[PDB]
């Protein structure tokens, strides 16, 4: 999981899957938005937060062997830390889940 809190605009820094990650979440009008950078170099920007649909969309981004992040429901900064979670999944289970998505 990802330890989160109920702030309209925030950032997280952690080491996941033998690599360094930095996620910042910010409200943008109706829906939440995120910017992802791995080991100091940005990957994708302005990705909408939706339940289930992974934040990293692209094979050259999410992994040759890295992981990915998935929301259980639609994001809402009021509910963070209370009934809503963000989950990091490494390569194996993420590949399995992606195959299941079909």
């Amino acid at each position: 999981k990802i330890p989160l809190t109920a702030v309209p605009n925030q950032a997280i820094s952690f080491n996941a899957g033998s690599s360094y990650w930095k996620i910042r979440l910010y409200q943008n009008m109706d829906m939440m938005n995120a910017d992802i950078s791995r080991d100091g170099v940005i990957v994708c920007h302005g990705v909408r937060c939706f339940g289930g649909i992974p934040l990293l969309q692209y094979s050259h981004q999410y992994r040759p062997d890295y992981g990915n992040f998935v929301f259980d429901r639609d994001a809402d900064w009021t509910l963070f830390g209370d009934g809503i979670n963000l989950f990091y999944l490494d390569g194996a289970e993420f590949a399995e889940y992606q195959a299941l998505a079909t």
Partner: protein, 50 residues
Amino acid sequence: LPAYNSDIQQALKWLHNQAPGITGLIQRKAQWYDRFSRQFWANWERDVFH
């Protein structure tokens, strides 16, 4: 969930309740932005619909 306003008229203050010049400037700028930054987007959206 929380509301967002993002309105140019918010710069107007009741100190300028009956000031013609400042309110004219602000409202004309707001009309220009309305013309070129959200009406155009609505038009382009209606364009992208096949």
